[PDB]
Amino acid sequence: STSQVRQNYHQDSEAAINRQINLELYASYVYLSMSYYFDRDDVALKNFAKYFLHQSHEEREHAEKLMKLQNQRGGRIFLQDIQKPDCDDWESGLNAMECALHLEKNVNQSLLELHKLATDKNDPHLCDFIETHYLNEQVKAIKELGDHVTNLRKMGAPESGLAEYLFDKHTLG
Amino acid sequence: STSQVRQNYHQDSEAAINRQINLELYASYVYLSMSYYFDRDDVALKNFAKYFLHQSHEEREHAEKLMKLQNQRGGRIFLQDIQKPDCDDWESGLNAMECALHLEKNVNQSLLELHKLATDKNDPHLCDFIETHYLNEQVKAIKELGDHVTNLRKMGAPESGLAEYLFDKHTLG
Amino acid sequence: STSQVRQNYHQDSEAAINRQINLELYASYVYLSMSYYFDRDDVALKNFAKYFLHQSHEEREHAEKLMKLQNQRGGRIFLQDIQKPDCDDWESGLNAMECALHLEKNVNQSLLELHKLATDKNDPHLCDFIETHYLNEQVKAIKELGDHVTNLRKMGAPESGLAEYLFDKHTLG
Amino acid sequence: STSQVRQNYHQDSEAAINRQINLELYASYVYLSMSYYFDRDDVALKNFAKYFLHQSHEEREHAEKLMKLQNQRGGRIFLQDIQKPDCDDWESGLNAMECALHLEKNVNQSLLELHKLATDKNDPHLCDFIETHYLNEQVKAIKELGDHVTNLRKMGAPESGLAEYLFDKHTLG
Amino acid sequence: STSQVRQNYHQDSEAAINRQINLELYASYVYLSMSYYFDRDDVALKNFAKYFLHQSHEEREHAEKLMKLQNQRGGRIFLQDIQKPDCDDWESGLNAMECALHLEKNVNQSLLELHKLATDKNDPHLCDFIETHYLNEQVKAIKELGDHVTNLRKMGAPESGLAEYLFDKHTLG
Amino acid sequence: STSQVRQNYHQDSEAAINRQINLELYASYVYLSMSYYFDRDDVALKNFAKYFLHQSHEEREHAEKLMKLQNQRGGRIFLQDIQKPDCDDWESGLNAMECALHLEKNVNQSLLELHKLATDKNDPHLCDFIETHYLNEQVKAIKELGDHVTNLRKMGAPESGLAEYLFDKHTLG
Ligand code: NA
Ligand code: NA
Ligand code: NA
Ligand code: NA
Ligand code: NA
Ligand code: NA
Ligand code: NA
Ligand code: NA
Ligand code: NA
C-alpha cells in the first residue's frame, strides 16, 4: 500500500499535515462567520465584511495547498468534520480583529510545531514547504492584525461607533 | 430583537435557510474530497480533479448567496459543523460521478422543500430567490452529471482504465 | 591554496557537490538514451522522445548550477567519467517511465544526503541552495512520473500499443 | 510590555538583530567613504565611485529590512552609534576592493552566527529570513569582489595606473 | 599636498563642511529612527513612517551633495562617528513632528553659520552653494513641519488617537 | 532484426557513427570543464567562460544530430562512457584556446576518416551528411581558434594578465 512516490515522508508528518488541513478549513469557516456578521443590517460595516471574506478565501487556498502537498509526497488525505466557530455574534470590529489575531497566532503555533516535526524527522522538503509558503505569511498576518487592533483601540473602539465607521472607510476601504 | 428590515419572513423560513447553508457547505466539502482523490498519484486524472474542484467552489458560492439572503431578509445566520464526507476513497471516475449525481439530487430535494415552505408561508420573494438562483442550476447540474455517467458507462468504465482516461481528456478537458 | 572567497565551506561538502555533479550528468545521459530509443523507426513515439530529451537538457542545467555553486563557494570542480546508461533498449514507454521514476528517486536520495551533510556541517547557505533549487523540483518530478506510470498501467501498457500511442498523443503531446 | 504580535521570538534573537542592524549601517558608511575617495580629483575613478556608492545604498536597504523584521516580530529596535570607517584614504582601487572583500566576509560571518542562533532557538521564521534575504546575497557579493580583486591583480594593479583605469572603464563601466 | 583644483577655499570652510556632513548624516539617522517607531505594531501609523523615511533619505542626499562639494573644491572629507538619536521611543506623531521641527531649526542654524563663514572668507562659490541648495530647502521644511504641528495640535493630538489617525490618512497619505 | 528503413548502410558506417557520437559528447565535456575553469574566482574571465560554454552546448547538438542520423538510417545507437577531460586546471586563456584547437583538429580528423569510410562503402547520403553538417563547421572552428591563439600570443599572453583581460573584453565580449 506504500505510494510509488513516497520517499522520506514519515507517518507522523502525514498525520500532522492532515491536522493542519482541518485547522486551515476551520480558520476559513471562522472568517466566513465574521464576514457575514459585518453584513448584518444592525452592524453594516461593508469593508470589515470584505476583509474577513478575503481572509476566508485565503485560508481555504492554504488548506488546498496542504492537500496538494499531501498527494505530492504520497500521503493520504483524511478529512474530518469542520467545527463551527466559537461565536455567532462577533460584537464589534475590534472584537473580531482581536479574535482574528488570536486565531492567527494559534495557526502559527501549529505551523511551528509542524516545522519542528519536519526538522526532527529530517524532512527538509517539508520544512522548506512550511517556511516558504506558511511562516512569513503568518508573521505578516499577525503584524497586520496587530496594527488594526492598535488603530481601533487608539481611535476609541468599540465605544465609539464613529471609530469603527472611519476605520472601515479609511483603513479597510 | 426583530430586525428593522424584517418583513414577511417567517421563523420557519429562516431556520430552513440555515439548514440549506449547511447543506451547501457540506456539498462543497464533498466535492473538495473528490477533487483531491483524483489528484492522487495512484489515480492521476487531472481533469476529474479540476471538474470537482470547480464544483466545490461553486457550492461555496451557493452557500454564501444564502448567507447574503439571510441578512437581506433580517434573519440571523447560525452555522453548524460541516460533516466530513462519507468516503475518503472515491474508487473511480464513474463512482464519483454517480455519488455527485446522488448528492445533487439530495440538494435539489432540499431546495424543493424550501420552495414549498416559502409558498406555504406566502413568501414570494423567497420563493422567487430559490427559483431564480437555485432550481434551474440544479436541473442543469443533474442533467450534466447524468450525461457523464451515461458516457462513462457506455465507454466501459470503471473496468476500462482507457475509458476514464479518454473521458478525462475529451469530455472534461 | 584556500580560495579567497571560501567561508564556512567544508571539504566534505565540496566533495559531495562533485559527486552530485557527476550524478546529474549521468541522469542527463540516461534521459538522452531514452529519448533516442523512442526515435527509433521500430518504436516511433515522438512525444516520448521529446519528453525525455527535455528531461536530459534539464538535468544538464542542474549539473551546471552545481558547478556554479562550487565556484561561488570557492570549491574546486573535479569531473569524473560519465558512465553509460544501464540499458541500450528501454523496452516500452511504461518501462522507460518506471526507470525514470527509479532514477529520480535515486537522485532525490542523494540530494537528501547532501542536505543532511550541509545541516551537519552548519552550512545554511548550502542547505538553502539544495532546498530552493533541487528538493521541490525532485518532488514534482517524482509525482509527475508516478502519475504517468499510473495512467499507462491503467490504459493497458505495455501489452496495448494503442495505450502508448494514445498516451503519447494526449498526455505527452 | 510584551508585544501583542510576539511569538517564538527569543530575547537573544532580538538583541542579535539589533547588532546586525548596526553592522549593516556601518558597512553602508564604509562604502560611502570609499565612494567619495574615488571621486577625489587626485584619484578620479568615476566607476569605482559609482560601484561603491551603489553598495552603500544596498547596505542601507539591508539595514532597513532588518528593522522591518524586528518590528514584524514584535522586537524593539535600539540604535547605536555608527562608527567611522577605519580609513579615510583607501589607497587604490585594488586596496578598496580587498577591504570590501574583508568587510563582506565579516558581515557574512555575523549572519552565519545569527542563523545558528535562530536554529538553536528553534526560530524557523528568522532562520528562513536570513537564508532567503541575506546569505546568497553575501555569497554573490563575496564572489564578485574576489573576481574583481583577481582581475585587478592580474592586470598589474596597483603599480599600473593603466590597470585601474582600464578596469574602471571595462569592468565597472 | 594642496589639491591641484583648490582655489579660494579656506581651511576653516573645509572643516565646517566636514562638520555639516556629519550633521546631515545624524539628521538622516534621527529620521530613520522616527520612521521605524511609527512602524511598530503598537504605534501603527504607516504614513508617519513613510514621511520620516522620506526625510531620512533626503538628508542622506544632502550629506552626499556636501561630500561632492568638498571634493569639487579640493578639500578632503573626514568622516566621524554618527551619533545615535536622542530617543528610542518618539511617543506620538505630534512629539515626533515637534522633534523634527527642532532638528530642522538646528540644521538651519548650522547652515547659516556656514554661510556667514563663507561670506567672511570671501568664498562666493561656497556661499552661493549653500543659498541655492540648502537655505530655501530648510525654510520650506521648517514651514511644513510647523504646519503639521499646528494641525495636529488643533485636531487634539496627542490625547486624541483619532486625531493622529486622521492626520496620517488625510495629510500624510 | 534488420530495420525496415535500412538501405545502403554498412555495419562499419554504423559503428563509426557510434564512435563519433562518443567523441562529440567527449568534446562537449571538455568544453564544459574549460568553461567552469574560467568561472573560478582566481581566474575570473567571464567571456572565456561564456565562449567555452557555448562550444559545449554546440558539441552536444552535434552529438544529437548524429544520433538522429543513426536512427534515420536504421542503425542502432550504442552509448559508451564519456571520459573525463585530460585536465582539471586549464592554466590560462591561451592554453585553453590551444587545447581547444588541438581538440577540434582531432574531431576533424575523425570526421575525415568517417567521410572516407562513407565514400569507400558507396554511401553518398552519409558522405553528404558529413560534408553538409560537419566539415565546414570544423574548418570554421579551427580557423577561429587559430585566430584567437594568434591574437593572444601577439598581445603577450599568457605572461600578460592584461592581454587576457583585454581579449576577454574586446574579442570574446
Ligand atoms: Na492559513
Ligand atoms: Na529554507
Ligand atoms: Na449548491
Ligand atoms: Na418566478
Ligand atoms: Na537533476
Ligand atoms: Na549587507
Ligand atoms: Na539636510
Ligand atoms: Na562537433
Ligand atoms: Na556534396
Using a CB-CB distance cutoff of 8 angstroms, which residues of chain D are in contact with residue E36? 67-68, 70-71, 77
Contact between E145 and E106 (Cβ < 8 Å): no
Three-state helix/strand/coil letters over chain A: CCCCCCCCCCHHHHHHHHHHHHHHHHHHHHHHHHHHHHCCCCCCCHHHHHHHHHHHHHHHHHHHHHHHHHHHCCCCCCCCCECCCCCCCCCCHHHHHHHHHHHHHHHHHHHHHHHHHHHHCCCHHHHHHHHHHHHHHHHHHHHHHHHHHHHHHHHCCCCCHHHHHHHHHHCCC
**Which residues are CB-contacts of D164 (< 8 A; sequence separation ≥ 6)?**
D45, D48, D92, D93, D94, D152, D157, D158
> Residue F2 burial (CB < 10 Å; 0-12/13-18/19+)?
exposed
Task: Determine the Cα–Cα distance for residues C142 and F96; give it in Å rounded to an integer.
Answer: 40
Experimental method: cryo-EM
Using a CB-CB distance cutoff of 8 angstroms, which residues of chain C are in contact with residue B166? 166, 170
**Cα-Cα-Cα-Cα dihedral sign, residues E34, E35, E41, E47:** positive
Task: Determine the Cα–Cα distance for residues F109 and F118; give it in Å rounded to an integer.
Answer: 14
Cell of C126: 548550502
- Give how far Cα F71 sits from Cα of C41, C143, C167, E148, Å: 7, 31, 23, 81
Contact between C131 and C66 (Cβ < 8 Å): no
Note the maximum CA span of chain F: 61
Note the Cα D14 to chain centre separation in Å: 20
- Residue E74: left if φ>0, alpha if ψ -120 to 50, beta else—which one? left
Q: What's the alpha-carbon Rg for chain B, to the nearest Å?
A: 18
Contact between A79 and B88 (Cβ < 8 Å): yes
Residue with cell 519536519: A118
With H, G, I as helix, E, B as strand and everything else as coil, classify residue B82.
strand
**Interface with A, mutate which of B32, B61, B72 (most A CBs under 10 A):** B32
Span from the CA of D129 to the centroid of ligand 2 (angstroms): 8
Cell of B56: 466545490
Contact between C144 and C125 (Cβ < 8 Å): no
> Residue F11 burial (CB < 10 Å; 0-12/13-18/19+)?
exposed
Give D25→chain C minimum CA distance, Å. 22
**Chain F residues 24-43 within an 8 A CB cutoff of chain C:** 25, 29, 32-33, 36, 39-42
Closest of F12, F43, F9, F27 to residue F109, by C-alpha: F27
**Which residues are CB-contacts of E119 (< 8 A; sequence separation ≥ 6)?**
E127
One-letter amino acid of E135: L
Residue with cell 572629507: E77
Using a CB-CB distance cutoff of 8 angstroms, which residues of chain C are in contact with residue A74? 146
Task: Determine the Cα–Cα distance for residues D73 and A112; give it in Å rounded to an integer.
Answer: 14
Q: For F80, which of C25, C64, C84 is closest by C-beta distance?
A: C84
Using a CB-CB distance cutoff of 8 angstroms, which residues of chain D are in contact with residue F169? 170
Span from the CA of D114 to the centroid of ligand 6 (angstroms): 13
Residue with cell 514651514: E143
One-letter amino acid of D31: Y
User: Given an 8 Å threshold on Cβ–Cβ distance, is F67 in contact with C40?
Assistant: no
Residue with cell 504605534: E43
> Residue D72 burial (CB < 10 Å; 0-12/13-18/19+)?
buried
Asked, as a colleague might, if the bond just before B158 is cis with ω within 30 of 0, I would say: yes
Span from the CA of B56 to the centroid of ligand 1 (angstroms): 19
Cell of C37: 530509443
C82 φ, ψ to 5°? Answer: -95, 110
With H, G, I as helix, E, B as strand and everything else as coil, classify residue F20.
helix
Cα–Cα–Cα angle for C2, C7, C11, rounded to 5 degrees: 65
Contact between F161 and D167 (Cβ < 8 Å): no
Task: Determine the Cα–Cα distance for residues F70 and D52; give it in Å rounded to an integer.
Answer: 56
Task: Determine the Cα–Cα distance for residues D99 and D37; give it in Å rounded to an integer.
Answer: 13
One-letter amino acid of A12: D
Span from the CA of C51 to the centroid of ligand 5 (angstroms): 15
Closest of D154, C80, C133 to residue F38, by C-alpha: D154
User: Given an 8 Å threshold on Cβ–Cβ distance, is E42 in contact with A150?
Assistant: yes
Cα-based torsion angle of the residue sequence E25, E29, E34, E35 in order, rounded to the nearest 10 degrees: 90
End-to-end Cα separation, chain D, in angstroms: 52
| Residue B71 exposure: Cα atoms within 13 Å on the Cβ side | 19
Length of chain C: 173
Q: For F82, which of C42, C78, C82 is closest by C-beta distance?
A: C82
Q: For E71, which of D25, D33, D40 is closest by C-beta distance?
A: D40
Span from the CA of B95 to the centroid of ligand 3 (angstroms): 20
Cell of F84: 573525463
Residue with cell 472611519: A166
- Give how far Cα A62 sits from Cα of A28, A57, A108, C75, Å: 9, 9, 13, 40
Task: Determine the Cα–Cα distance for residues C27 and C15; give it in Å rounded to an integer.
Answer: 19
Give B94→chain C minimum CA distance, Å. 15
**b/e C55-80 (16+ beta carbons within 10 angstroms → b):** bbbbbbebbbebbebbbbbbbbbbbe
Give A27→chain C minimum CA distance, Å. 27
With H, G, I as helix, E, B as strand and everything else as coil, classify residue C82.
strand
- Residue A156: left if φ>0, alpha if ψ -120 to 50, beta else—which one? left
| DSSP codes joined into one string, chain D | ---TT--S--HHHHHHHHHHHHHHHHHHHHHHHHHHHHTSTTT--HHHHHHHHHHHHHHHHHHHHHHHHHHHTT-------BPPPS-S---SHHHHHHHHHHHHHHHHHHHHHHHHHHHHTT-HHHHHHHIIIIIHHHHHHHHHHHHHHHHHHHHTTTT-HHHHHHHHHHT--
| Residue F54 exposure: Cα atoms within 13 Å on the Cβ side | 9
Task: Determine the Cα–Cα distance for residues A24 and C19; give it in Å rounded to an integer.
Answer: 41
Contact between E75 and E9 (Cβ < 8 Å): yes
Q: What's the alpha-carbon Rg for chain C, to the nearest Å?
A: 18
Task: Determine the Cα–Cα distance for residues F58 and F30; give it in Å rounded to an integer.
Answer: 12
Classify domain D2-173 at the CATH class level.
mainly alpha
- Give how far Cα D128 sits from Cα of A134, A167, C126, C132, D17, Å: 11, 34, 13, 11, 14
Task: Determine the Cα–Cα distance for residues C55 and C71; give it in Å rounded to an integer.
Answer: 25
Cα-based torsion angle of the residue sequence F7, F9, F10, F11 in order, rounded to the nearest 10 degrees: -100
Residue D131 assigned ligand-binding role: no
Looking at the DSSP bridge assignments, the partners of residue F82 are C82
B82 φ, ψ to 5°? Answer: -95, 110
E82 φ, ψ to 5°? Answer: -95, 110
> Residue C118 burial (CB < 10 Å; 0-12/13-18/19+)?
buried
Number of H helices, E strands in chain F: 6, 0
- Give how far Cα E2 sits from Cα of B109, E9, F50, Å: 98, 11, 47
Domain boundaries, chain A: 2-173
Cell of B116: 414549498
With H, G, I as helix, E, B as strand and everything else as coil, classify residue E22.
helix
Closest of E105, E99, E82, E89 to residue E28, by C-alpha: E82
Task: Determine the Cα–Cα distance for residues B162 and C160; give it in Å rounded to an integer.
Answer: 10
| DSSP codes joined into one string, C84-100 | PPS-S---SHHHHHHHH
- Give how far Cα D71 sits from Cα of A107, A150, D2, D9, E95, Å: 20, 14, 12, 11, 20
- Which chain F residue shows the shortest CA-CA distance from D162? F162
Give C72→chain D minimum CA distance, Å. 6
Contact between C133 and A66 (Cβ < 8 Å): no
| Residue C136 exposure: Cα atoms within 13 Å on the Cβ side | 15
**Which residues are CB-contacts of F16 (< 8 A; sequence separation ≥ 6)?**
F113, F114, F117
Contact between C53 and C111 (Cβ < 8 Å): no
